[PDB]
Amino acid sequence: SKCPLMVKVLDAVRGSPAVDVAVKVFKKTADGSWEPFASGKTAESGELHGLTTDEKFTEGVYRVELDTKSYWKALGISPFHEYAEVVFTANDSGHRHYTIAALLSPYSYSTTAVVSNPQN
Amino acid sequence: SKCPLMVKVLDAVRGSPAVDVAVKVFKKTADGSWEPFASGKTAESGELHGLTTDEKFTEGVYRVELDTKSYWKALGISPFHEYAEVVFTANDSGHRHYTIAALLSPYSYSTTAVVSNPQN
Amino acid sequence: SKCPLMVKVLDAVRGSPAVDVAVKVFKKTADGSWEPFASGKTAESGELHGLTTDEKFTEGVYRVELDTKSYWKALGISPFHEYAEVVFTANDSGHRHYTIAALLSPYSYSTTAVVSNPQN
Amino acid sequence: SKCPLMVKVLDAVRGSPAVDVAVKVFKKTADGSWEPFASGKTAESGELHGLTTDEKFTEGVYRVELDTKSYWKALGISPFHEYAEVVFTANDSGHRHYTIAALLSPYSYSTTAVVSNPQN
Description:
Chains A, B, C, D: Thyroid hormone-binding protein. Probably transports thyroxine from the bloodstream to the brain. Chains A, B, C, D: Belongs to the transthyretin family. Four copies of one chain form a homotetramer. Chain A is 5% helix and 46% strand. Chain A is globular. Chain A has 120 residues and is mainly beta. Chains in contact: A-B, A-C, A-D, B-C, B-D, C-D. The interface between A and D is medium-sized, with 22 and 20 residues.
């Protein structure tokens, strides 16, 4: 009933949840390379859920890339960052659910982790 | 040696120093009151040097008040916040040298403090 | 949704929402002072809904203030800030719903506003 | 700074500069690959001045990598992010002066640039 991975994104310039920011989730392989894990556009309210399956999202290193640049390039603003990425290692270690947050601005971005534990 | 108290502001939209920002400083009189301590404007580098010396800067709660509204407003952007503040106690756990840094954005902002003992 | 003013606080140290952080919303009266408006403390989720009804939240400037001082202090960390204040004008025009978010850290905080609207 | 790439890393939990934060700067390649551009750590000023020269800092896509995991780890704290990366294209205007800041906390970091001009 709940997926671990989820992204939220806000736009600090117009007090708005950034919509349609492109999200790409990359999972670290055995050899030490990256393969695609999930992909999607931020919905109309900032959130992007139903990204992975509560069982496909297994232990490992991850990297969420939010294409922040085309987002700002779309409204007349040339951004600093080429994009924004978030590397963490989700795990079966517990604290099984995660939501990544973004506070996007032309020359600055804060990223927030928020892990939770369901009822075991 | 360094400034017992300083302020620096940034522009998350232009990727640059917040220039010419009014900064008022008030000190709480032990009875509730807030009396004028100092004030000034952020120079080109975004900083604001000289707010007080150690002799003046005393143990007690203070309040920095950067007028974020007049700033964006002078550009054409109607910001959310009326102004911005940082309320804190100083010199109580010892006379230190503070630095209140602030990141501005029309609908969002951040302040951070670096507490530094003098060169002693 | 069916709530005009909500506040969502997060805890950057713990990686979970800042639970039981006492909020105190004031409303500037016509005389110029701050008459009590709403007042609660973060529910487990780190948020607050029933602060006011969609009719009580009239056009005017407001002051939301979070007691970070006691939050951090109940965990043993002596924060820098005395509290966290966000005065904004809720000129109930294009947008009726407001969401004041804030990320806490012992020496740094970040507020942001998200003003959606009664869409359809 | 009078040299091209200067990096500044503070601490939201200790309100102090972040010293010994290993920093690596890469450079995209003609093959879209990533050629190794720089290495260094943050001094006691939680600032790293000692990387490139205007002469050597050409136009291109960079990726500054801040080893946040080792930082939080040495202190006993257990972080979420593995690294903090600032990927930006540079000098596509005639080589300017860059400054990257990073505010650190275990479950959320924040980066911002300040594009300066030596002549202008």
